[PDB]
Design an enzyme around this catalytic site. Structure first.
Site, PDB file in Angstrom:
ATOM      1  N   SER A  46       0.796  -1.059   0.097  1.00 10.30           N
ATOM      2  CA  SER A  46       0.060  -0.201  -0.128  1.00 10.30           C
ATOM      3  C   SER A  46       0.720   1.303   0.025  1.00 10.30           C
ATOM      4  O   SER A  46       0.415   2.439  -0.045  1.00 10.30           O
ATOM      5  CB  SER A  46      -0.921   0.102   1.146  1.00 10.30           C
ATOM      6  OG  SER A  46      -1.681  -1.196   1.037  1.00 10.30           O
ATOM      7  N   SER A  94      -6.231   2.954   3.959  1.00 12.06           N
ATOM      8  CA  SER A  94      -5.708   2.013   3.205  1.00 12.06           C
ATOM      9  C   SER A  94      -6.457   1.162   2.339  1.00 12.06           C
ATOM     10  O   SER A  94      -6.551  -0.054   2.526  1.00 12.06           O
ATOM     11  CB  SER A  94      -4.310   1.214   3.805  1.00 12.06           C
ATOM     12  OG  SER A  94      -3.496   0.993   3.020  1.00 12.06           O
TER      13      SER A  94
HETATM   14  C1  LIG Z   1      -4.019  -0.963   6.722  1.00 11.50           C
HETATM   15  C2  LIG Z   1      -2.977  -1.760   6.001  1.00 11.50           C
HETATM   16  C3  LIG Z   1      -1.520  -0.857   6.428  1.00 11.50           C
HETATM   17  O1  LIG Z   1      -1.487   0.026   7.209  1.00 11.50           O
HETATM   18  O2  LIG Z   1      -0.634  -1.400   5.747  1.00 11.50           O
HETATM   19  C4  LIG Z   1      -2.936  -2.600   5.167  1.00 11.50           C
HETATM   20  C5  LIG Z   1      -3.937  -3.880   6.094  1.00 11.50           C
HETATM   21  C6  LIG Z   1      -3.687  -2.495   3.942  1.00 11.50           C
HETATM   22  O3  LIG Z   1      -2.709  -1.458   3.270  1.00 11.50           O
HETATM   23  B1  LIG Z   1      -1.908  -1.925   2.423  1.00 11.50           B
HETATM   24  O4  LIG Z   1      -0.499  -2.066   2.784  1.00 11.50           O
HETATM   25  C7  LIG Z   1      -2.456  -3.357   2.153  1.00 11.50           C
HETATM   26  C8  LIG Z   1      -2.547  -4.328   1.079  1.00 11.50           C
HETATM   27  C9  LIG Z   1      -3.393  -5.524   0.914  1.00 11.50           C
HETATM   28  F1  LIG Z   1      -3.300  -6.364   0.079  1.00 11.50           F
HETATM   29  C10 LIG Z   1      -4.232  -5.552   1.919  1.00 11.50           C
HETATM   30  C11 LIG Z   1      -4.433  -4.598   2.778  1.00 11.50           C
HETATM   31  C12 LIG Z   1      -3.738  -3.608   2.802  1.00 11.50           C
END
Ligand code: A1EIQ
Length: 241
Positions: A46, A94
């Site tokens: 993300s 995110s």
């Molecule tokens: C909130 C998040 C963070 O703070 O990292 C995560 C859970 C979110 O944000 B990403 O990094 C990503 C990727 C995915 F495939 C699934 C979920 C996320």
């Protein structure tokens, strides 16, 4: 570049391993606890919401930071995703499916040209257009994240000034009378090694310190360590009190 292995103490304190990379903008000097891992390229997960946001804004997929992206009605495991979002809240929580739709609208040809223009990581978008930053070919190191973020800070990426300002607003994470943090987290779970990221910068009155960290993340229980370990390093280096 200087290596400072003393920061390993902050990882070891939490039975973790990882890297923090700092860049002192005024002095044009970098510091890290692990010169090798600082330059190891991983899926961005993300943290890719930073370039994806910039491209979406510059191509008009996102009109402004108030435009509402309605929930598609599919209930997902992260409850905050199960609601309407704008760019500010989609960054904050995110919200993957919002950004997957942006990427489909951008399309692979424009996404690839934009990442080349940004000099972003290995510039490889192989995989699904709507998931390559999660389980495709794109790889970026912590030092490469810093190079990219420095361009964003200085409005030097190949997109408009407005798009860059809006994304920096949407990166706002913490502010008080001592510092401002603009940053984005990431969590790469689909492809080994499972890692967490935090990348961004700390604005001071008279300098800016760019940072990029990643760390092994075998389960979601340690996600808060991304920020905690970074802050221990920033405190040690007297960047934040
Ligand atoms: C909130 C998040 C963070 O703070 O990292 C995560 C859970 C979110 O944000 B990403 O990094 C990503 C990727 C995915 F495939 C699934 C979920 C996320």
């Amino acid at each position: 570049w200087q290596e400072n292995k003393s920061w390993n103490a902050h990882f070891t304190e939490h039975k973790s391993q990882g890297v923090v990379v700092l860049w002192n903008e005024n002095k044009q000097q970098g510091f890290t606890n692990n010169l090798k891992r600082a330059n190891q390229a991983f899926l961005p997960a993300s943290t890719f919401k930073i370039p994806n946001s910039l491209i979406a804004l510059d191509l008009g997929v996102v009109k402004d930071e108030h435009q509402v992206f309605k929930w598609d009605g599919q209930t997902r495991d992260i409850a905050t995703w199960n609601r309407d979002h704008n760019l500010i809240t989609a960054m904050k929580y995110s919200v993957v499916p919002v950004y997957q739709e942006f990427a489909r609208q951008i399309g692979e040809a424009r996404m690839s040209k934009m990442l080349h223009a940004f000099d972003y990581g290995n510039e490889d978008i192989s995989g699904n257009v709507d998931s390559f930053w999660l389980d495709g070919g794109i790889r970026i190191s912590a030092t490469e994240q810093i190079s990219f973020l420095r361009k964003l800070y200085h409005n030097k990426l190949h997109v408009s000034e407005r798009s860059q300002r809006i994304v920096k607003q949407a990166m706002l994470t913490e502010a008080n009378g001592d510092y401002i943090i603009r940053a984005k987290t990431g969590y790469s779970t689909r492809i080994e090694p499972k890692i967490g990221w935090w990348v961004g910068w700390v604005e001071l009155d008279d300098n800016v310190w760019f940072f990029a960290m990643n760390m092994d993340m075998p389960t979601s229980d340690g996600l808060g360590l991304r920020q905690a370990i970074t802050k221990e390093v920033l405190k040690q280096e007297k960047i934040i009190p």
